[model samples]
Target chain A: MKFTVEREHLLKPLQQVSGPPILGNLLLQVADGTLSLTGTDLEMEMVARVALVQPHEPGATTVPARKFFDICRGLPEGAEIAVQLEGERMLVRSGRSRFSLSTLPAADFPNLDDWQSEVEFTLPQATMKRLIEATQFSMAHQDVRYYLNGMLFETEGEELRTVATDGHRLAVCSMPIGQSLPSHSVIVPRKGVIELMRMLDGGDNPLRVQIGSNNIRAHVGDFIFTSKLVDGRFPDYRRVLPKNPDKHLEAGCDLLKQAFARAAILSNEKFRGVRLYVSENQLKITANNPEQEEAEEILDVTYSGAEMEIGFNVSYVLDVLNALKCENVRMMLTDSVSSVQIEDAASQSAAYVVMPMRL
Target chain B: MKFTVEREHLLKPLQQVSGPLGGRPTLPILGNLLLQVADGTLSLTGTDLEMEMVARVALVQPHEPGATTVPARKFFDICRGLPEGAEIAVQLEGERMLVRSGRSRFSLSTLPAADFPNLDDWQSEVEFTLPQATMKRLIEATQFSMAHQDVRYYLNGMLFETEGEELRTVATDGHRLAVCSMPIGQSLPSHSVIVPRKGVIELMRMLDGGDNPLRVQIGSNNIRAHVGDFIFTSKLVDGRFPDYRRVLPKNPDKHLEAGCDLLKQAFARAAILSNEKFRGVRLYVSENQLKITANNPEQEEAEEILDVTYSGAEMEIGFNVSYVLDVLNALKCENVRMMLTDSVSSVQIEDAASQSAAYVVMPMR
Candidate 1:
């Protein structure tokens, strides 16, 4: 088989469909005026297809993904790359550069073509990207309970909701969808969620998503992302999500961020606990470490609730604040003992709930 | 004792003097910076036996002039994290040092100033001055070739030589040698000294790349540099450098000059497929073209060809790609030249039309 294509158009698809060296081989098929590349680690797979510039003879082969990508990246930009199958070896020539790379039999490569989908829907690429970024960080890593190791994706009426929690804190984000579907939930493994997010680059193009009994797949533009799902039930986030609290306060995001950043330097090096004292029209943050070092900050806030004090992991609150980009944030508390719910002052679409710490 | 200094003025000096903390300090005083407040000046000094740096800052107000040493890294970190323009008040109480700025206060443990060790006074044998930029360039061009923990201990340092009206720096690692020199415009007695690898690096950091003159003093066993308000002293490596004159290629008329950037790019691309253990690349030179090829045990091969001006007899040689790359990275010229006697002999490299800097690389078997 032989084909020719510009270097610019080939580098991107080659990178997206190429896995690390440890993943072994990547399959490349040039036939029917199309060049297709596929790579997989058995848990996640990516497939990218592009139009061939000139198709000579149809054939298929597999080569080391990382080495092939490196060669393509090093080539002069805007150069024309020509590839031809010379026996069992692949000959790549561009200008004065030539490369002879070893290849494995294409038949031995794993293919995910036979998997059947039970349910599928379509959504904008930007919407899908937003759903993942807003909730992916809270996923538990290497948890003894396997279900908590991935984000939960569920459909409700005409909206899609995502929830993730590490037992200490939880995040929930949802967006409206165009089509209505039966309520179903899937636990996308952490690696799968990460790869899926990387594939979407804030484009407004529509993405077709399919949920199978044991795996999930997303097709975006010319690339297809597939991964296996964790086989367990996600926690009942609705039961854990806090309800309407009796006390709440509003504060500027910048003011709270600065105060917390300073207090963090003096918090316990291990637990990173900081106490928040709420009083009339103000909030007091204080932290004291085992080394007898103390830090305190007073922030002017708008609150009419009963005075109360609570302790929380400062880093957890900081993470939520970083994920949120808003002018002001609202913090609601039922008392000093219950969990606190934080949301953007202008919108309630994204909310974070953090459990209080006993200092 | 108490004193206040602006955070901006204190942070820069702290970083320069605190580099000695990486020596795995054996004594507590070694990890501390000796702070002396006297005559309206605060002197900060950090030492690690092999080298020491002293930086002096003007004090706003000196109260009961005294001396103490505090942990170098902690003190610097506290000062750096404070807001810019914040006035930091430092006070000593018993064995602790109290620092307060704005709403932040840090109490760091201190050691007795009398326990801190200082370098002995050295009598200078040669004193000279050179532009900081010129000195910085000379060191950078040759310092990379210095040996690292080699059994031949003498090769682990760079030789600074001055003869007649020229100043030169040379370093080698058995496989390759690099030398750079410039006219000092003054007649001085010939003197040679080997500065340890760490000292050379510290000196480079201390010298700002500018036209300001830096005064250098070389003693029997140590070298000192004075720049602005900082003084740097380092112990010399007592050993004889190799006789570099004999190794310099003589009358190598077969030469080729090529565009520096294009040749570097081709080399970088060809190196990707080279052997992971022994990076070997073959160079095939002909009438007007140079061909580079590299191969590994995995059966992968990479080839690149570049056009150049050459008239020598065609020859092929093996070389370590990284050694060739070092000279290319250090030189800032439009065109670079390569001189060769044969495939088995060392090749001399330098600017296409200049002879101020030279590099020699021994061919591989």
Candidate 2:
């Protein structure tokens, strides 16, 4: 088979579909004047189709996916690339340059041709992007709790909720999907969730999504994504968020962020614990390291009620403050030992819960 | 003893001098900066036995002249994080140093100034001045070729040579050599010194690349430079550098001139498929076209043809693509010429516009 295509048309899809090296190769199939590039790691598969240039010929083959993509990346933009398949080899010619790569038979490439959708719906890209980002940071890495190592997606009625937790902190957010589908929940593995987010944009264009029993697929514009879901139940996020705590405090987001960041420098490197003493209209934060170095910060807060002192892993609070990106963050607490709930004072759609540390 | 100085005067000098403090020092006082306030000027000095930096700032008023050493990192951090332009007050009482700025306060531990060590042999034999940008250019041009952690310890730095009115900088890693020369305009006694790798890097970091003059003092065991308020001193490597003159290619019969950008791009593309371990690429030069071909042990091959100005006998040679790419990246000219003798001999590369800086890379088998 022989066909020529512009480097611009082939660059993005090749980059998106290819995974890290020493893994399997990418499949290139041209049939009925249509061309598609695909890659898989047994658990995740991505296929991207591009416009076939003239002289389209029907054929199928596979080559080292990342190496081929890297070659295209180094080529000049808009350079026309002509590809021809030889026995057990593929020749890629662009202008005055040519590449001959060993090929593997495309017939053996793994593909989800029999993946049947159990639940189908269309959601705007903006809605899907927000659902993943709001809780993506809390997804656990290197956690033994397999399900918690992924972002949990649940569709109930017309709203799609996303949750992530690592035992020390939990984040949950909800967005309206504009239409209802059969209620379902799926745990997308950490790597797959990141790849899906990379394909989304904050636009109103609707993208098709299908959730099956053991797999989830998304048709994100030019790319088709399919990944095997973690076969385990995610913890219920509702029970993790502390509800209706008697004490509430509001402080400037930037003020709290800066104070916590500074105090963290002197905190014990092992535990990273900082103590917060809150009373009427005042809050004092302090931390000390093993070297006897101390960091102290005092500021005024819109808080009144019973005085309390709490210890927490400073890094978790900083993460929430950065992700909120809003002015005047509200903190709801019960006492010195319970978890604290923090959210934007003006909006309640997103909440971050961080458990206290015994300093 | 105490002094009040603005954060502006303290923060920059602290950072500049503290760069020389790395790796745990044998003495606790080595981790501290000796700060001295006297004659309306404040001096901050930091050292790590091999190198030392002194920064002096003037007009620090309301001062009681005194000296003490404090933790370099902590002091720098506190000064950096404080409100910009804030007037900072510092006092040494007993064993604690009190730092007060607005409502912020820090009491830091200190070591006696007398306990801080200095470069014992600080005497110099030669003194000269040159344009700051020229020194910066000389260092930046050849710094990349310095041998890294090599047992041939003297090759682990750039050689500085002075004679008549010429000042030249040279460095090599055995496989490649880079040399840059410029006229310092001051006739000086002939001398040569090998500045250790770390000192050359730190010198480049301290340069501003302005046209103003920088005074340098060359000592038997240490090199000192006075650039504005900073007085940088670094110990020499104390060994002889390799005779780089032997590696430089001479009287090549084949000379090829090619567009820098075009060659760079073509070489970069071919490098993607080259051998993962050796990074070998073959060059075949004919009448007016140059062919670049590379392959890996996996049998994958990449071939590129580029235009050039060559009329010599057709010759093929192999070179590590990384070395060629480095020379190409450092060159700033429209066209570059490569002087080659044969397939096995080293190739000399220089800017077609002006050969002020020259590069030579040994051929790969």
TM-score of chain B of each: 0.97, 0.97
Give fnat of each prediction, in order.
0.41, 0.46
DockQ of each: 0.43, 0.53
What C-alpha lDDT, on a 0 to 100 scale, does residue A222 get in candidate 1?
95
TM values, all candidates = 0.91, 0.95
lDDT of model 1, residue A302: 91
Cα-based RMSD of candidate 1: 3.1
Q: What lDDT tens digits, residue by residue, belong to model 1 across residues B262-350?
A: 78877877787789888888899999999999888887898999999999999998888999889899887899999988988999999
The residue-level lDDT of candidate 2 at B160 comes to 94
Expressed as tens digits, the lDDT of each residue in A1-359 for candidate 2 is 77888888887788788741324698898977678988888778888998775888888998887678888888887898899999988999989999999898877777665667888888888888878888899999988888888999888888888999999899999888778766789999998999888877666677889999889999977788898899887889889888669888899998888778766766776789889999999888887776666677787899966999999898899899988888889999999889999999998778899999887
**Clash counts for all predictions:** 0, 0
Interface C-alpha RMSD per candidate, 1 decimal: 2.8, 1.8
